Design a protein around this ligand. Structure first.
Ligand SMILES: Nc1nc2c(ncn2[C@@H]2O[C@H](COP(=O)(O)OP(=O)(O)NP(=O)(O)O)[C@@H](O)[C@H]2O)c(=O)[nH]1
Ligand SMILES: [Mg+2]
Length: 165
């Protein structure tokens, strides 16, 4: 059996979208990753209990000037990962508005995950785990804290999404 899933990453600029995709797909992390100006397309293939799973992944430009283009990438998506930065409350608020947009405008069957990224920066935390967990539970979102830098929960969040599709 082979399954293929269409996935999109959304979120404020600098939260770590490209770093997360790069860690999952290439096992790489770049401390000096440049801001995305044009959406990038990547694939990874994994094994999941009796199935070979291929991911098709859109890594969007997070800056607000590219907002109007986002539906090109999420309208056909089966799953989305909305990413925020645990060290910045404003990015968590922005993530909630991405979630709201998906709920109103993307497929009614979309699986929405929420990633609290940069969790390795524990001494710089702004958003408490419990607050994000409660928001996720209330809105039916698949929530994990992640680190592209250390790889913490990077494999885990993509695999959890695949299990639910
Ligand atoms: N400490 C730490 N730094 C991280 C982590 N993930 C990304 N970064 C760093 O944060 C910066 C921004 O990451 P990047 O992936 O470019 O963010 P982005 O969400 O793709 N930005 P844009 O939307 O503008 O393309 C980079 O310097 C990157 O190395 C993480 O988990 N921990
Ligand atoms: Mg990027």
């Amino acid at each position: 059996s082979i399954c293929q899933f269409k996935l999109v990453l959304l979120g404020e600029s600098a939260v770590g979208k490209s770093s997360l995709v790069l860690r999952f797909v290439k096992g790489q992390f770049h401390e000096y990753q440049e801001s995305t100006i044009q959406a990038a397309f990547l694939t990874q293939t994994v094994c999941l209990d009796d199935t070979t799973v291929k991911f098709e992944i859109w890594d969007t430009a997070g800056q607000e000037r590219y907002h109007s283009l986002a539906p090109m990438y999420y309208r056909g998506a089966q799953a989305a990962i909305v990413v925020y930065d645990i060290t910045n409350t404003d990015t968590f608020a922005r993530a909630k508005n991405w979630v709201k947009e998906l709920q109103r405008q993307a497929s009614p069957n979309i699986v929405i995950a929420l990633a609290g990224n940069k969790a390795d920066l524990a001494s710089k935390r702004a958003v408490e785990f419990q607050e994000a967990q409660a928001y996720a539970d209330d809105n039916s979102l698949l929530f994990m804290e992640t680190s592209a830098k250390t790889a913490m929960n990077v494999n885990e969040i993509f695999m959890a999404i695949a299990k639910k599709l």
